[PDB]
Amino acid sequence: VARKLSLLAIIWANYNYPPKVKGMSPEDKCQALTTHLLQTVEQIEKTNIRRMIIEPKLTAYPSNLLSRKLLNAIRDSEEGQFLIASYYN
């Protein structure tokens, strides 16, 4: 989530200078978290912009690439093949 937040700060580095993060713990990404609300001020429908900052979408998976199960479920399912064909036709 710190990587994503630093990406977001980088995107809007023109409007405001991003603070240093060098030599800093993974928990202290809260400074970047705080400054992105400041950057959000400078432009429309900010609700979605702020939501990705304060409440980042995240989905932890105990298993490891998991992908094979999804592939098998897609191939076995009739609809799944129907949906793929509909998308690509």
UniProtKB/Swiss-Prot annotation:
It is found in: Virion. Transmembrane segments: none annotated. RNA-directed RNA polymerase that catalyzes the transcription of viral mRNAs, their capping and polyadenylation. The template is composed of the viral RNA tightly encapsidated by the nucleoprotein (N). The viral polymerase binds to the genomic RNA at the 3' leader promoter, and transcribes subsequently all viral mRNAs with a decreasing efficiency. The first gene is the most transcribed, and the last the least transcribed. The viral phosphoprotein acts as a processivity factor. Capping is concomitant with initiation of mRNA transcription. Belongs to the paramyxovirus L protein family. Interacts with the P protein; this interaction forms the polymerase complex. Interacts with host RUVBL1 and RUVBL2 (R2TP complex); this interaction regulates the viral transcription. This is RNA-directed RNA polymerase L. It comes from Mumps virus genotype A (strain Jeryl-Lynn) (MuV). The chain holds residues 1616 to 1711 of 2261 of the full protein.
